[PDB]
């Protein structure tokens, strides 16, 4: 009853922060936000951009995906983003995460009726 568009709006965004608060950021986000229930997710990326210049890119470059699929797209602007890492020593339920802020082009999967984010694929 969560839709994908919701799933990512709760993995991939957040606007609230221009940037990557603190160095423990990570840490309560991939918490906070469930990434950490049945397993450590080991990357994950948030945005700190609105949710409709996020929801533009659907309509931006349109770069093949990852795994092969066509309906990725490449934002024309770089974006404020914090990507999260599982550290070495991370173990579950205790999941650690290394925080980094960057400026990129985010990547996203769109599908759907409207055409919205669903995965996010790669920063560059």
Same mark, same amino acid.
Do not use: L, W
């Given at each position: 009853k969560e839709t994908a568009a919701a799933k990512f709006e709760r993995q991939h965004m957040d606007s %609230?922060? %221009?940037?990557?608060?603190?160095?423990?950021?990570?840490?309560?986000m991939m918490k906070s936000r469930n990434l950490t229930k049945d397993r450590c997710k080991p990357v994950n990326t948030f945005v700190h951009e609105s949710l409709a210049d996020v929801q533009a890119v659907c309509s931006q470059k349109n770069v093949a995906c990852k795994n092969g699929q066509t309906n990725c797209y490449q934002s024309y602007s770089t974006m %404020?983003?914090?990507?999260?890492?599982?550290?070495? %020593?991370? @173990?579950?339920?205790?999941?650690?995460? @290394?925080?980094?802020?960057?400026?990129?082009?985010?990547?996203?999967?769109?599908?759907?009726?409207?055409?919205?984010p669903v995965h996010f694929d790669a920063s560059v």
């Open positions: %609230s922060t %221009s940037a990557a608060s603190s160095s423990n950021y990570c840490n309560q %404020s983003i914090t990507d999260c890492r599982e550290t070495g %020593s991370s @173990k579950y339920p205790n999941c650690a995460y @290394k925080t980094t802020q960057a400026n990129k082009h985010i990547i996203v999967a769109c599908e759907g009726n409207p055409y919205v």
